[PDB]
């Protein structure tokens, strides 16, 4: 009978003590997992019957399913010496680099399927896991999140490849199982830890088709508290008018970013709508993958970290410009491609957002 559910409780005032949010929950025989630090709701399970009562309770504001997302990037093609994929030039951070730039004491939350901790070609500083049988960050199972990881942080030294921020301080914020996909609520645990933990930039390469209330509150949050948050636009391509943008992408607080080639042509699986504001690489994206080989894949999964790694190279720059004069600059600088249903504001320049 049971089903996972997000209850949201209505704001001030009881709601907020702990003990009295799991008893709404306990009385109607529910299941509570996780009360959230930062949004006002509790992850539960519950049956069909509890749900409408639930729902009754003068005190609940929702309840909401506990989404599905997945991350939204895919295998393209796959000891070596240096070389930069060209999505890094594409954006222009060798500009950055030249001048020292490389986004030194910027800290940066990769929220994926974990980071290959092991690999010669990243490192990685701290994180954690929120999928319950998968407890560690380090290891990454589905081999999607330190593909993102390298695209904005594969050290600058003699080997494989080259971020778009080569000294970034990296985390690894586990929250997609082997299988590439998560919970919503092991996400919105994913970003509040970003948020106790003063990450300056976080990023998700990843996402769901459904809206969910919590999940607004904490992407909101993390924006509030001053951190620039990178979203994935999605994969599901076009489709006239209506947007396909996915979640957390769609809500106006994350930059969303959907897929350009080399040519800065809108790629394929683009996802398009209005909540789209930058583009960047994410076709053939070459990037470390786990046991210390590299490989390329296509997604708005990869397009994303370069976005990522732009705004760590602004803030190492410009350290006292605060999320929204970064995103400004990302968006008020990018380069025009076409109709902003398909390119938002085109594809960033950083070494233009730099200036
Ligand atoms: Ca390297």
Redesign the pocket.
């Known amino acids: 009978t049971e089903k996972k559910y997000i209850v949201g409780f209505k704001q001030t005032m009881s709601a907020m003590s702990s003990a009295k949010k799991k008893d709404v929950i306990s009385e109607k025989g529910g299941k509570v997992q996780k009360q959230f630090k930062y949004v006002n709701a509790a992850a539960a399970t519950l049956d069909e019957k509890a749900v409408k009562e639930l729902k009754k309770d003068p005190s609940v504001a929702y309840v909401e399913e506990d989404h599905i997302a997945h991350e939204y990037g895919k295998p393209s093609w796959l000891q070596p010496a ?1 070389s930069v994929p060209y999505g890094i030039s594409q954006i222009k951070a060798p500009a950055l680099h030249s001048q020292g730039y490389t986004g030194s004491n910027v800290k940066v939350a990769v929220i994926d399927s974990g980071i290959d901790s092991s690999h ?2 990243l490192n990685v500083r701290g994180g954690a896991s929120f999928v319950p049988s998968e407890t560690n960050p380090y290891q990454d199972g589905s081999s999607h999140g330190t593909h993102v990881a390298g695209t904005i942080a ?10 778009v921020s ?1 000294s970034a301080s990296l985390y690894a914020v586990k929250v997609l199982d082997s299988t590439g996909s998560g919970q919503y609520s092991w996400i919105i645990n994913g970003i509040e830890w970003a948020i106790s933990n003063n990450m300056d930039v976080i990023n998700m390469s990843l996402g769901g088709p459904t809206g969910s209330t919590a999940l607004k509150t904490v992407v909101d949050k993390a924006v509030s508290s001053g951190i620039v948050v990178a979203a994935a636009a999605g994969n599901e391509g076009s489709s006239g008018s209506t947007s396909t943008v996915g979640y957390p992408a769609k809500y106006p607080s994350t930059i969303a970013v959907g897929a350009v080639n080399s040519s800065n042509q809108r790629a394929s699986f683009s996802s398009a709508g209005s909540e789209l504001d930058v583009m960047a690489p994410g076709v053939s994206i070459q990037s470390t993958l786990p046991g210390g080989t590299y490989g390329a894949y296509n997604g708005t999964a990869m397009a994303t970290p370069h976005v990522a790694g732009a705004a760590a190279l602004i803030l190492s720059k410009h350290p006292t410009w605060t999320n929204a004069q970064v995103r400004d600059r990302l968006e008020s600088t990018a380069t025009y491609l076409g109709n902003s249903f398909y390119y938002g504001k085109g594809l960033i320049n950083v070494q233009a957002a730099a200036q």
């Open positions: 240096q010669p070609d594969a050290l600058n030294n003699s080997i494989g490849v080259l971020g080569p």
